[PDB]
Curated annotation (Swiss-Prot), chains C, F:
Similarity-based family: Belongs to the histone H2B family.
Post-translational modification: Monoubiquitination of Lys-89 by BRE1 gives a specific tag for epigenetic transcriptional activation and is also prerequisite for histone H3 'Lys-4' and 'Lys-79' methylation.
Species of provenance: Xenopus laevis
GO molecular function: DNA binding; protein heterodimerization activity; structural constituent of chromatin
Protein name stated in the entry: Histone H2B 1.1
Keywords of this entry: Acetylation, Chromosome, DNA-binding, Glycoprotein, Isopeptide bond, Nucleosome core, Nucleus, Phosphoprotein, Ubl conjugation
Residue numbers of the full-length protein present here: 33 to 125 of 126
Phylogenetic classification of the source organism: Eukaryota, Metazoa, Chordata, Craniata, Vertebrata
Swiss-Prot record, chain E:
Residues shown, of full length: 702 to 743 of 787
Subcellular localization, as worded in the UniProt entry: Nucleus
Biological function: Functions as a component of the ISW1A complex, which acts in remodeling the chromatin by catalyzing an ATP-dependent alteration in the structure of nucleosomal DNA. The ISW1A complex represses gene expression at initiation through specific positioning of a promoter proximal dinucleosome.
Stated name of the protein: ISWI one complex protein 3
Other comments on record: Present with 1770 molecules/cell in log phase SD medium.
Record note on quaternary structure: Component of the ISW1A complex, which at least consists of ISW1 and IOC3.
From Swiss-Prot, chain I:
Cited function: Core component of nucleosome. Nucleosomes wrap and compact DNA into chromatin, limiting DNA accessibility to the cellular machineries which require DNA as a template. Histones thereby play a central role in transcription regulation, DNA repair, DNA replication and chromosomal stability. DNA accessibility is regulated via a complex set of post-translational modifications of histones, also called histone code, and nucleosome remodeling.
GO biological process terms held by the UniProt record: nucleosome assembly
Positions carrying Phosphotyrosine: Y32, Y69
Locations listed in the record: Nucleus; Chromosome
Name this protein carries in UniProt: Histone H4
Full-sequence portion shown in this chain: 21 to 102 of 103
Taxonomic lineage of the native organism: Eukaryota, Metazoa, Chordata, Craniata, Vertebrata
Length: 95, 107, 93, 86, 42, 93, 107, 98, 82
DNA sequence: GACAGCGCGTACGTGCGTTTAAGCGGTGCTAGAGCTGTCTACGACCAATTGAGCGGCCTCGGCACCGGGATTCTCCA
DNA sequence: TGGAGAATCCCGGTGCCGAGGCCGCTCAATTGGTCGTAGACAGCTCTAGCACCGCTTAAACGCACGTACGCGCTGTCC
């Protein structure tokens, strides 16, 4: 058995050197249709539109992980808690 | 009689006529100066060269001969001035620069 | 339709710098988008400038200055040098 | 003519994918309290865009969402993307 | 000796003016890599 | 020469809400700038909208959409409301 | 015949003719329809009214009669909707909303 | 026994004084002089509207204010009450000015 | 005639005045220089492009319109100055 | 108040079989993506008039101020 | 826990020029024309968006457990 954390660096490097999408596509499309339900009914979708939607989502959230990680490491920690995200989005001005 | 393109008149690589048309159709001012499209395509090609050259550098560095978006991201982020120009820019399938904060390294 | 893009120009200059190098199609479209955004940002700033001084026509002075105001330092230095060269070459020929 | 109403695909946001997301962020150690937080904030961003997406769709009189719709929305919010036209 | 030093000064003049222009070119610590891309671009 | 601004309308409407209240001139400039800005932002947005649909004419349709864009929620519903009645008023006139 | 201002025709306070001229002179698009300046000015006045009501309330809250920039600031930052609309905006002499975080108070 | 307030309550006094106040916190002439010094670099022998000088300042202090308030957010989340430059820089990191 | 070194004209009491108006209670001694540098940066950017407007305007007097245009383009639109 | 020391107990990371549901073509299938003639009606432009806006000029009225009692935070007790 | 001292607070005079009206006067807002084109629009076509089907496999799940991280507090010193 490995010591916990070296594995983490393993996936860190795997996914930092990789570029392919990280989300199952069907759940994404389903969620999108859910969300769109709220503004107008019966709306048809470009697949590529969905794809870019996804892409944008991960870009947003990934920068979110970055600045949250900075917040946490400033707190001399390594484990992330919602405190950090809330402060981060507040500073960026989303809250 | 034999036409001679304004770009060739500048030894230029983008179409000046195209860009001049777009300028005129783009509703920026009713009247357009003449050397403006010239200078325009010039700086365009400049930036084009600046970016593609790094992209090819990266493609060579990873032993490939066709440049892929990954290279685009790598080159854009590993520049200071370009990245500041494109700090608000997201590239599809671009990933990020592999970079690890020192604090999480094992020791 | 007769969908327009700048791809061929990119291809030529690509050969100009790295004459032996391929490229993604998706990345090519990315290049299209990039050149586009460059166009619009600089154009809009310039048109702002034209309104600003109460002039009605876009010349080289405006475009050059816009290049200054958008580009950071050295990039602008290089581009302005080149634009001077290029407009000189056109007007001279 | 099948028009059903969805429910809870936000839990279609699997735990492993979220962790993978954090790992692309280079994140090392994680709370369980993070995950629902992520689902919510993600949701927020999702509507924030999709709303104006539909706005574009409708002012085109149109019934289908185009990519350029998303493009223009994200550009409104300064989230410039390359690679899809526009 | 006067002729000798005249020789010396002619010899110096090259490198001296070379510095005189190097400073003008490169007074500032600058990423001259782009400056060489100026030439390679032309 | 002359220097055009909005202030008189500001004062009219202020009397229309608080008939019992004065105003600073600096605050007056604040509001002048305010109207300036909002006009510009919304107008440019609508102009883009027109381009996106290859239209050469300004209607209120894009304006409605555009307000929906820039103002959020109750702001928008209110604004579209008064606009709807107002254009109704002029047209029905 | 006797001429009636378009703003009067809508029962308006902002000048339709002035705005319409502004639009024409702005080079935003090649043509302008009739109802657009009206629709715009109406939205304008609605917004102005909202702001003015809030600021007059503020000035009343301090037993003054003249609206000042400070009341503008106090009101607008005290609005959720307006302030998000004006979140990227600074006001001259505006000041801030007095706000002390809890942990900063002595216990 | 001379009467002295405890360390910190005074700070709250000025904090309230300035959070209610609305005016400048900066001296005029040193500020104008810094303006002149920096502007020296780009062009020589420039003239200045005083109104411009003002506009410069208000922009400055407002920007600064946002900066420090975020800095305090940093410090409080960081479980302290004294501000330290690492907070300043980290906030600046977050917002994204390089 | 030359000018220099008025960045020290930004005194510590002014600095802590700003900090207080920001609602801060306790301050490191290292803060002041940090602040001065950051302010240096801000002011440099803004003056720079403001000047840029000035010269293309072919004037020799910086105007408040050039200043407002610069910080509005930055993202801190300042009202109250036409 | 910041900082570090240390111990401790818990919520978190790694294996690990075990489902399971996303994916993947393969197949229908209809709805709206994507067009093209065609014909007005509405703004673009221009031409008589004019009224409202803007600027200059009084004028008085909120309002900052002053200072003196009058009324509360603070800090040991 | 109660008072002493400091800090605020408030209010009624006390100055004072900035809103606040106000008014000649000139130009942009309004008005009635023409005119040609843009855009409305239905049709026509037709494209892509959707629904559906086994079925396999890769990826998510359950859970234990153990393991190291978070956290508390406290002297101490600057």
């Amino acid at each position: 058995r490995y010591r916990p954390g070296t594995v983490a660096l393993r996936e860190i490097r795997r996914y930092q050197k990789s570029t392919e999408l990280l989300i199952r596509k069907l759940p994404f499309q389903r969620l999108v249709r859910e969300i769109a339900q709220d503004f107008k009914t019966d709306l048809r979708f470009q697949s590529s539109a969905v794809m870019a939607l996804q892409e944008a989502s991960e870009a947003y959230l990934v920068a979110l992980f970055e600045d949250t990680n900075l917040c946490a490491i400033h707190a001399k920690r390594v484990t992330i808690m919602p405190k950090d995200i809330q402060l981060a989005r507040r500073i960026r001005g989303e809250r | 009689a034999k036409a001679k393109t304004r770009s060739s008149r500048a030894g230029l690589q983008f179409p000046v006529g195209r860009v001049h048309r777009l300028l005129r159709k783009g509703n920026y001012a009713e009247r357009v100066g003449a050397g403006a499209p010239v200078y325009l395509a010039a700086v365009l090609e400049y930036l084009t060269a600046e970016i593609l050259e790094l992209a090819g550098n990266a493609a060579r560095d990873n032993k490939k001969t066709r440049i892929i978006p990954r290279h685009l991201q790598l080159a854009v982020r590993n520049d200071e001035e370009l990245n500041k120009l494109l700090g608000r820019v997201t590239i599809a399938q671009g990933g990020v620069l592999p970079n690890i904060q020192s604090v999480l390294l094992p020791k | 339709s007769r969908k327009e893009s700048y791809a061929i120009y990119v291809y030529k200059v690509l050969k100009q710098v790295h004459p032996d190098t391929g490229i993604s199609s998706k990345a090519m479209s990315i290049m299209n988008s990039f050149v586009n955004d460059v166009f619009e940002r600089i154009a809009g700033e310039a048109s702002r400038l034209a309104h600003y001084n109460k002039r009605s026509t876009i010349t080289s002075r405006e475009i050059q200055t816009a290049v200054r105001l958008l580009l950071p330092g050295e990039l602008a230095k290089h581009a302005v040098s080149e634009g001077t060269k290029a407009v000189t070459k056109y007007t001279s020929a | 003519r099948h028009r059903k109403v969805l429910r809870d695909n936000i839990q279609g946001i699997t735990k492993p994918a979220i962790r993978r997301l954090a790992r692309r962020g280079g994140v090392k150690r994680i709370s369980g309290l993070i995950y629902e937080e992520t689902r919510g904030v993600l949701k927020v961003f999702l509507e924030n865009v999709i709303r104006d997406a539909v706005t574009y769709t409708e002012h085109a009189k149109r019934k289908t969402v185009t990519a350029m719709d998303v493009v223009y929305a994200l550009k409104r919010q300064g989230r410039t993307l390359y690679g899809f036209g526009g | 000796k006067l002729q000798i030093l005249k020789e010396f000064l002619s010899d110096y003049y090259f490198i001296l003016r070379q510095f005189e222009q190097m400073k003008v070119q490169f007074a500032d610590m600058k990423p001259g890599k782009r400056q060489l891309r100026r030439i390679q671009r032309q």
